[PDB]
């Protein structure tokens, strides 16, 4: 979607492997602010939105 009408999707009731996101080289920028990138596999979250 366009930036004015950005799409928001809920992620819930799943187990997420973030290691495939860090180790993938396709992303030019992988920058995290309130969480460390390497610690994402060790934490539990709810109400995740993309």
């Amino acid at each position: 979607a366009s930036v004015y009408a950005w799409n928001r999707k809920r992620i819930s009731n799943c187990v997420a492997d973030y290691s495939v996101l860090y180790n993938s080289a396709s992303f030019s920028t992988f920058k995290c602010y309130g969480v460390s990138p390497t610690k994402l596999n060790d934490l539990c979250f709810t109400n995740v939105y993309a």
Binding site: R8, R10, S12, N47, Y49
Partner: protein
């Protein structure tokens, strides 16, 4: 985040609200992410 808190109380007062204390238990945590400014309740008709 749309929070629904609910409580059911057995009452026997005829017209107005009873006077007392009853804490509302949290019922539903709803992920909507939309703007809400106006609401309307739904009633049921009886047909004869």
């Amino acid at each position: 985040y749309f929070k629904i808190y609910s409580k059911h109380t057995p009452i026997n007062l005829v017209r107005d609200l009873p006077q007392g204390f009853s804490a509302l238990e949290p019922l539903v945590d709803l992920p909507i992410g939309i703007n809400i400014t106006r609401f309307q309740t739904l009633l049921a008709l009886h047909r004869s």
